[PDB]
């Protein structure tokens, strides 16, 4: 079935979109309330060793990491280990374990019912979208839609996971500024491969230059790719572990890139405040209260610092490969082989401006 741009049909779709959105949001609130109520329980079980927010944050992140699996077994040993419950010298361990397992069972059973309600609303929302995606595409924004993007999550992202600050403690400080702006450099030994062209005749020079050019361009293609992918992963992690509300990841990616280069140019630039401001301004009502505990700030600080560190490592690797490439090109020019690099110079331009326009 399909609906034309006729006004009868368009007002139906906007009304139905709004209603399903409001129904899904009420279910999400009910889910959050159940996680909060459980976390309040567990805080008291642990004699307030961790506060309720910290426990809720772990539970919710683990729930998303586990594809919203409602099996209590996915949470029980994970919380025992993550919160080091057995090592708490303050409590009667065995009654705590019993209450915890029972509380996980009752709560996860209720969240299961809620998540299955959300799934049914999601099915109707997608079927509504499929009726208008060709005839009135503008009624839906695929870069941010809460429901169309509901299952996306940065699994296996390498930067953050639900047990952060419990089981490992990454730095919240961005890398040393002098290190971050210093260009990657190569040694004389790394240029041996280029200077080794000098004893060769013209035919083997051209062969070897062609072979090395191909190898360097392939390496650089991968590096630019990976650098862009890191910004994308950083943005997805900020959305899913910190903000926990719908947003346009493309917009956030652009800002993370801008801020990286801003920091290189100005060591006093405040990247964290810039990202906080952005996330505060996403919701038109400014009704999204998301930075409500220091743990959220710390996760954000880690993600900014770990992503930028990785991105900087790639940039220095790009500098080093380009240094060999430029040395090879300069040699080729001296052998009247400048034209061997016209096409690769073009590729490298194309790879370099992906994601930067």
From Swiss-Prot:
Glycan attachment residues as annotated in the record: 41, 342
Subcellular location: Cell membrane
Domain of life: Eukaryota
Record function comment: Membrane receptor which tethers secreted RH5 to the merozoite membrane during merozoite invasion of host erythocytes.
Oligomeric and partner information: Forms a complex composed of RH5, P113 and human BSG/basigin; the complex bridges the merozoite and host erythrocyte membranes. Within the complex, interacts with RH5 (via N-terminus); the interaction tethers RH5 to the merozoite membrane.
Protein known as: Surface protein P113
Organism name: Plasmodium falciparum (isolate 3D7)
Lineage: Eukaryota, Sar, Alveolata, Apicomplexa, Aconoidasida
């Amino acid at each position: 079935d399909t609906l034309v741009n006729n006004k009868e049909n368009k007002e139906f779709v906007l009304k139905e979109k709004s209603s399903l959105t409001s129904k899904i949001n009420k279910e999400l609130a009910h889910r959050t309330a159940l996680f909060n109520k459980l976390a309040d329980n567990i805080s008291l079980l642990l004699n307030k060793k961790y506060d309720s927010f910290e426990i809720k944050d772990v539970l919710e992140d683990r729930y998303n990491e586990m594809k919203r699996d409602a099996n209590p077994d996915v949470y029980y040993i994970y919380l025992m280990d993550t919160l080091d419950i057995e090592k708490i010298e303050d409590i009667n361990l065995e009654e705590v374990k019993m209450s915890l397992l029972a509380s996980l069972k009752e709560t996860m059973n209720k969240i299961d019912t809620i998540e299955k309600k959300i799934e049914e609303f999601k099915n109707k929302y997608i079927s509504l979208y499929n009726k208008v995606k060709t005839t009135m595409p503008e009624l839906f924004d695929l870069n941010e839609d809460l429901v169309l993007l509901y299952n996306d999550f940065p699994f296996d992202n390498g930067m953050i996971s639900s047990d952060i600050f419990f089981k490992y403690n990454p730095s919240e400080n961005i890398m040393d500024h002098q290190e971050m702006v210093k260009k990657g450099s190569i040694t004389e030994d790394e240029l041996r491969i280029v200077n080794d062209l000098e004893p060769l005749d013209n035919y083997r020079r051209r062969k070897r230059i062609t072979e090395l050019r191909k190898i360097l361009v392939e390496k650089l293609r991968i590096l630019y790719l990976e650098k862009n992918n890191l910004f994308n992963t950083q943005a997805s992690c900020i959305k899913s572990y910190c903000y926990k509300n719908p947003l346009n990841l493309k917009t956030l990616e652009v800002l993370l890139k801008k801020n990286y280069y801003r920091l290189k140019e100005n060591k006093d630039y405040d990247v964290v405040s810039s990202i906080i401001q952005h996330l505060d301004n996403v919701d038109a009502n400014k009704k999204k209260k998301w930075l409500t505990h220091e743990r959220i700030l710390k996760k954000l600080q880690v993600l900014i610092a770990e992503g930028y560190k990785r991105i900087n490592e790639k940039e220095k690797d790009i500098d080093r490969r380009m240094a060999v490439y430029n040395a090879l090109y300069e040699k080729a020019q001296s052998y009247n082989l400048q034209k061997l690099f016209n096409d690769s110079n073009d590729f490298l331009k194309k790879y370099a401006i992906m994601g930067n326009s």
